Design a protein around this ligand. Structure first.
Ligand SMILES: Nc1ncnc2c1ncn2[C@@H]1O[C@H](COP(=O)(O)OP(=O)(O)OP(O)(O)=S)[C@@H](O)[C@H]1O
Ligand SMILES: Nc1ncnc2c1ncn2[C@@H]1O[C@H](COP(=O)(O)OP(=O)(O)OP(O)(O)=S)[C@@H](O)[C@H]1O
Ligand SMILES: Nc1ncnc2c1ncn2[C@@H]1O[C@H](COP(=O)(O)OP(=O)(O)OP(O)(O)=S)[C@@H](O)[C@H]1O
Ligand SMILES: [Mg+2]
Ligand SMILES: [Mg+2]
Ligand SMILES: [Mg+2]
Lengths: 120, 58, 428, 130, 429, 87, 65
């Protein structure tokens, strides 16, 4: 039966070697040509009125193929995110909280203003 | 200090090897006999010589 | 077997049918009659081959069915596949992805081929041993050598998992490794193999070969590759957007430098725009300046309109083209066919469609074609062939042509019968 | 292809634990080695859209491409030509068969002049259907 | 360059030292008054004093308006940025028309940057620290650098020890050290230590030529539009941006003002020199009323380039209006902001001169009687048509084994190819 | 001041909805033979030519089914100046 | 071109043609108004529908362990 195995190997190998890329790597390589941050943080204050997690699609008996595909998708995304995770986190996390600025703790009372003058 | 400032002797200039068969600038070295060569004919001659020499030696 | 390409409306045309002196031969390469137009198209083809003069525009104008598209197909066939021939319809420029001017600019730049030569020095061989400093042993059918390995080279060998018995190519100019496959042997046979596994012979000749490779691309492809990081994907999807003028100017200058250095050749081709009267006044105004470049291809256009309204305006102009753009082009005029030319076109279509017809059938079908249209008779060729085959005959007779004439109407008879029952049709 | 698919746990081990979040599938009935001659019907448009955008890539840009908004795109004439060439090669090899079909355009009066004027070239092509 | 275009013979305005136009020079024939006015426009451009000055080339088709604009471009040289546009280009699908207009305005303002760098490059020969008593303490790190010219020892600040180990400099490495920052950059092993037996690519470089210490001047040419695009979208956000299509954006006036400020600072610092140039808008009658109105404001900017419009439409309805006819397709308000240069029809003699110059540029031998026949064809028909007959008649002659066009070749090509008027005649019949 | 935070909108559905478009592998062919774009990150036109040239024929498959550091002086004699080396 | 008044069997005759051909032969129905995609140009819609109407039966032996 080794003859059939050799036939299968030859057919698959001939199919795999037969096709050239449309463009290829060498072609692309040879065709290639050769301050407000301080003012931004003082103005970033809008919080959204509502926040909600994404809707979750609920099924009994989730398919093994669907679950496996989602698992591998998440694994790949998290593996690729790991070298850049803090950047993703800081460049995606929303602004949810808004505390009154500590400057108002003085501003709220004139006693604290005169005390500021006296202590300075 | 010696870790941060190692006093490294300057690297030696390499031997500009030459093929013993044709006396051309060496492009390769045979893995078996460790002799540089510059053409396929040189490789064949070198391997024939090596087999003859290993037969004579033992 | 049914290949992708089958018998179409111009399958019979295999060139303009001209001689060395560009004299039009009757019934050559599938073309019949249109002697003056075929001679003019031959002169234009010689201009295209010469390539020296950019942005020459020709308008093939004539009545419907007079072989304008036929002449375009003959020019495309006579012109080698090496030289670009970008054929679009006038309506192909109205895209949501790009302006009309961007679509015209891309159509122009598809029509200029640039052929880039490159020489590389590569080391290709079969891996005998690898030792992690590091050492690598490669071999061919004629040689064996051993190399010392640097940090990045050993890193590449490890990351690609080069294992003994593989056939690899390493480029000295860039130090990158590519695995061409693993050499088959008795110990390496398996009951199943991975998708990436490819069996290959041990390389021949010397390990360090000097290559000479020539890539044929186009200015639009160079544009798209330089549009963005993964721009070459847009050469498939077409989501090129509008490419910036900086990129096009930089590419024009780079191709000029390459040609000056002798690295590249420029192969100017043809942009055929059939049904050109679908362009609007803005497209025509863009073309007025697009043809004044030195990277303009030879432009060929076809239309059948007379003194008609220019699209996008209320003015009427010959061929639906403003006289600004007509002054930039030469006009080749086609002529309606005689009885002999009609009969010989029908004969060539019978020969291509593989239909055997009696002489009386040829006479009656030629009369039908003269009375109604050439396309109707060509369609009736295969219709009558099918009807004859259903009759278990081997040659199409007049009764079969009468039969298919009674089955399939033309424009005139269908319009007359529609008028007879006009009360039942909508919105007369 | 060497593709491996784990289609669950064997049902003989369904009692190995009283509570596991696993999918038990019965032991295969036939032989270990299975051969089957098969047919699949595809359209040329399917090949066009398959090569329109990379799929199944493990690289981050391919994973984002899986994530992004799916859009129709204006597939280029060059990709269609290359797909035609590959289909022709495999028809020659004997492992594929062309089956040309029919495109039915009802209420064709709704096309504008531009669609008709394009349909001139579209019908005159040697690859067009009936 | 090598391929021959419809204007490849236009080498400039054929003007004398006095500003008068020669009858036929630099590839241009006739149009003397128009060429003299174009020369005055060239003087206006070279003065660099004015901004937003507009000139309209106006006259019948084939009177050389585009030839005169490309002649101005030839006179100004390759240093002055000359931006060609056609009015059909404003109708983009990615951005609004007035953004296209403003982008083309900023493409016509050039800026020339001058960078002067001092660098100490060479192969490293020693890295001995200089120990001392502190008033192990080091007060200097001595680096010996070798080039083909010679060798130099440098007495660098000890703090450069961090950068040396960061770059992993060792003996036999080519490095360069910039005078200002004092940071070292490593660029590979010297190729004198490369063998043919070891495999590396990026890590070897030839021993530098020249003196160890070098002063380099780098001159770069940019446009204000280049700076606009660079500061509007700098090159994980980059990953998504490069995966997604990078469309044109409606750059805000805020960014343009910031870039104006930065460029003025560079010009004050002496690093840069401005080269304001020309925006050429052919087929300007393809602009619509919104574009013409915007151009009112655009030409009144103190930053605008000098713009050259061309039109041939005569008394025509303005696009995007209804029934508003205008003397050139260009509203009277915009026409009040432009100086108009008229272009006039050619005489048979001027047409013959143009035909001869075209035959010369195309490399075509034309006989005298063939030239006369083609001239008279061009006095019928059009000039453009008669010029277009040259190369197909040359090819017909080459087929018949003649090195020069004979009249019979012109006649035969005329019988093969027809003009717009003859075709209108055929259509009418 | 802080945002309201809502719980997610849970969206029930049957398992079959996700099993749609899942075809048995006995009706899926190796369509990868028509995959073009996937080859751009894999091979090259010159590499494709090499692979086509050096594919193993069936007969070769059927047929399939000492180092020491010497010196050039030790093996080969030196050559006198002005003479062509011969080996 | 199947031509005639409303309700004269044009669509019925087209579907009868589809029935006579069989399931293997592709039969792509479309209406003229389906070209006005907001994503792609009308000619791209028409080209897509042209390509759908050409089928390709691909024959293979699957081997699986
Ligand atoms: N001289 C010819 N020799 C051979 N076949 C011809 C000739 N003239 C026409 N035909 C064929 O007859 C048909 C004519 O249609 P076309 O070539 O499209 O005519 P046309 O001038 O393009 O008319 P329009 O403008 O497209 S409606 C096609 O099938 C042609 O291949
Ligand atoms: N005075 C001239 N001397 C030499 N060549 C000329 C002259 N005038 C025109 N030409 C050439 O003849 C052709 C016609 O001139 P153009 O500049 O194209 O006319 P135009 O005024 O731009 O016509 P429109 O308005 O754009 S249709 C071009 O190829 C010019 O290079
Ligand atoms: N010959 C026939 N035999 C049986 N049923 C028919 C026949 N002709 C029409 N019908 C049916 O009668 C109705 C007529 O509709 P269609 O066949 O769509 O006619 P139509 O010409 O397509 O009308 P329009 O132009 O689309 S509004 C449908 O329900 C058909 O199934
Ligand atoms: Mg046609
Ligand atoms: Mg002009
Ligand atoms: Mg119906």
């Amino acid at each position: 039966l080794l003859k059939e195995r050799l036939d299968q190997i030859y057919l698959v190998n001939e199919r795999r070697c037969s096709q050239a890329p449309v463009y290829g790597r060498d072609l692309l390589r040879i065709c290639a040509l050769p301050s407000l941050q301080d003012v931004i943080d003082r103005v970033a204050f809008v919080i959204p009125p509502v926040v909600a997690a994404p809707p979750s699609l609920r099924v009994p008996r989730p398919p093994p193929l669907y679950s496996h595909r989602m698992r591998i998708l998440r694994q790949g995304l998290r593996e690729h995110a790991a070298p850049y995770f803090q950047q993703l986190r800081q460049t995606t996390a929303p602004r949810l909280l808004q505390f009154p600025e500590l400057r108002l703790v003085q501003f709220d009372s004139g006693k604290l203003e005169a005390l500021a003058i006296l202590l300075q | 200090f010696e870790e941060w400032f190692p006093q490294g002797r300057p690297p030696k200039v390499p031997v500009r090897e030459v093929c013993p068969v044709t006396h051309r600038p060496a492009l390769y070295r045979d893995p078996v006999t460790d002799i540089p060569y510059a053409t396929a004919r040189a490789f064949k001659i070198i391997r024939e010589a090596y087999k003859k020499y290993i037969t004579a030696h033992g | 077997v049914t290949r992708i390409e089958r018998i179409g409306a111009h399958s019979h045309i295999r060139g303009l049918g001209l001689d060395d002196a560009l004299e039009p031969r009757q019934a050559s390469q599938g073309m019949v009659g249109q002697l003056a137009a075929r001679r003019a198209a031959g002169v234009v083809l010689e201009m295209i081959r010469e390539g020296k003069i950019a942005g020459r525009a020709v308008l093939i104008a004539g009545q419907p069915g007079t072989g304008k598209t036929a002449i375009a197909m003959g020019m495309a066939q006579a012109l080698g596949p090496d030289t670009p021939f970008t054929a679009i319809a006038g309506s192909e420029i109205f895209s949501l992805e790009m302006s009309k001017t961007e679509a015209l600019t891309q159509a122009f730049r598809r029509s200029i081929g640039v052929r880039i030569k490159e020489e590389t020095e590569i080391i290709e061989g079969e891996v005998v041993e690898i030792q992690i400093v590091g050492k690598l042993t490669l071999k061919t059918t004629e040689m064996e050598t051993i190399y010392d390995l640097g940090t990045k080279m050993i890193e590449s060998l490890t990351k690609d998992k080069v294992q003994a018995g593989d056939v690899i190519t390493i480029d000295k100019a860039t130090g990158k490794i590519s695995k061409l496959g693993r050499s088959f042997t008795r110990a390496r046979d398996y009951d199943a193999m991975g998708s990436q596994t490819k069996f290959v012979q041990c390389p021949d000749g010397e390990l360090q070969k000097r290559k000479e490779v020539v890539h044929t691309v186009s200015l639009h492809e160079i544009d798209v590759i330089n549009s963005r990081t993964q721009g070459f994907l847009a050469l498939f999807s077409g989501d090129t957007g509008e490419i910036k003028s900086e990129v096009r100017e930089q590419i024009n200058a780079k191709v000029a430098e390459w040609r000056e250095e002798g690295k590249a050749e420029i192969i100017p081709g043809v942009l055929f725009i059939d049904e050109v009267h679908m362009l609007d006044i803005e497209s025509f105004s863009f073309l007025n300046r697009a043809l004044e470049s030195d990277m303009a291809p030879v432009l060929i256009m076809a239309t059948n309109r007379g003194i008609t309204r220019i699209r996008g305006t209320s003015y009427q102009s010959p061929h639906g083209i403003p006289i600004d753009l007509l002054d930039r082009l030469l006009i080749v005029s086609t002529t309606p066919y005689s009885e002999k030319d009609t009969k010989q076109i029908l004969r060539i279509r019978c020969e291509e469609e593989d239909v055997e017809m009696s002489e009386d059938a040829y006479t009656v079908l030629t009369r039908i074609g003269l009375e109604t249209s050439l396309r109707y008779a060509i369609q009736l060729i295969t219709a009558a062939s099918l009807v004859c085959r259903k009759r278990k005959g081997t040659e199409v007779q007049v009764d079969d042509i009468k039969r298919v004439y009674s089955l399939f109407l033309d424009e005139s008879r269908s319009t007359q019968y529609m008028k007879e029952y006009q009360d039942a049709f909508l919105f007369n | 292809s060497g593709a491996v698919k784990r289609q669950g746990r064997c049902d003989t081990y369904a009692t190995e634990f009283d509570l596991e979040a696993e999918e038990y599938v019965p032991l295969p009935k036939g032989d270990v080695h299975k051969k089957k001659e098969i047919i699949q019907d595809v359209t040329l448009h399917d090949l066009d859209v398959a090569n329109a955008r990379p799929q199944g890539g493990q690289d981050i840009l391919s994973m984002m491409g899986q994530l992004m908004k799916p859009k129709k795109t204006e597939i280029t004439d060059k990709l269609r030509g290359e797909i035609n060439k590959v289909v022709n090669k495999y028809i020659d090899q004997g492992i594929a068969e062309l089956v040309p079909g029919v495109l039915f355009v009802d209420e064709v009066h709704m096309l504008d002049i531009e669609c008709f004027t394009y349909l001139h070239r579209a019908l005159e092509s040697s690859i067009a259907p009936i | 360059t090598q391929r021959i275009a419809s204007h490849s013979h236009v080498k400039g305005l054929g003007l004398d030292e006095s500003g008068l136009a020669k009858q036929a020079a630099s590839g241009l024939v006739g149009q003397e008054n128009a060429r003299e006015a174009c020369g005055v426009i060239v003087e206006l451009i070279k003065s660099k004093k004015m901004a937003g000055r507009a000139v309209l080339l106006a006259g019948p088709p084939g009177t050389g308006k585009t030839a005169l604009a490309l002649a101005i471009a030839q006179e100004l040289g390759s240093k002055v940025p000359f931006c060609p546009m056609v009015g059909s280009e404003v109708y983009s699908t990615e951005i609004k028309k007035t953004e296209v207009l403003m982008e083309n305005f900023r493409r016509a303002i050039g800026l020339r940057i001058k960078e002067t760098k001092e660098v100490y490059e060479g192969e490293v020969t020693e890295l001995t620290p200089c120990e001392t008593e502190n008033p192990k303490t080091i007060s200097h790190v001595i680096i010996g650098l070798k080039t083909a010219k010679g060798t130099k020892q440098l007495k660098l600040d000890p703090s450069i020890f961090e950068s040396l180990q960061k770059e992993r400099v060792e003996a036999g490495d080519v490095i360069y050290i910039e005078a200002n920052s004092g940071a070292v950059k490593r660029q590979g092993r010297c190729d004198t230590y490369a063998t043919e037996f070891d495999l590396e690519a990026e890590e070897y470089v030839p021993l530098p030529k020249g003196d160890v210490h070098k002063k380099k001047e780098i001159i770069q040419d940019v446009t204000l539009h280049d700076l606009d695009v660079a500061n509007a979208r700098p090159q994980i956000l980059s990953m998504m941006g490069q995966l997604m299509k990078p469309k044109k954006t409606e750059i805000t006036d805020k960014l343009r003002g910031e870039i104006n400020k930065v460029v003025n600072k560079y010009i004050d610092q002496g690093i840069a020199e401005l080269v304001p140039g020309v925006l050429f808008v052919d087929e300007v009658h393809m602009l619509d009323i919104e574009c013409f109105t915007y151009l009112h404001r655009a030409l009144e900017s103190s930053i605008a380039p000098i713009v050259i419009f061309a039109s041939n439409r005569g008394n025509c309805v303005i696009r995007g209006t209804e029934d508003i006819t205008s003397p050139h397709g260009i509203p009277l308000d915009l026409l009040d902001r432009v100086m108009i240069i008229r272009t006039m029809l050619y005489t048979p003699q001027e047409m013959k001169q143009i035909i001869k110059i075209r035959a010369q540029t195309e490399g075509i031998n034309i006989s005298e009687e063939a030239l006369n026949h083609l001239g008279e064809i061009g006095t019928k028909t059009t000039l453009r048509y008669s010029v277009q007959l040259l190369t197909p008649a040359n090819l017909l002659a080459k087929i018949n084994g003649k090195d020069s066009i004979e009249k019979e070749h012109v006649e035969e090509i005329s019988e093969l190819f027809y003009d717009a008027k003859s075709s209108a005649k055929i259509l009418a019949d | 001041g802080s945002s309201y935070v809502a719980g997610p909108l849970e969206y029930p559905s049957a398992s079959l909805i996700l099993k749609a478009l899942e075809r048995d592998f006995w009706k899926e062919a190796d369509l990868s033979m028509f995959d073009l774009i996937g080859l751009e990150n894999k091979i090259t036109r010159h590499e494709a030519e090499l692979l086509s040239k050096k594919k193993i024929p069936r007969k070769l498959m059927e047929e399939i089914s000492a180092a020491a550091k010497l010196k050039a002086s030790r093996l080969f004699q030196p050559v006198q100046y002005g003479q062509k080396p011969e080996g």
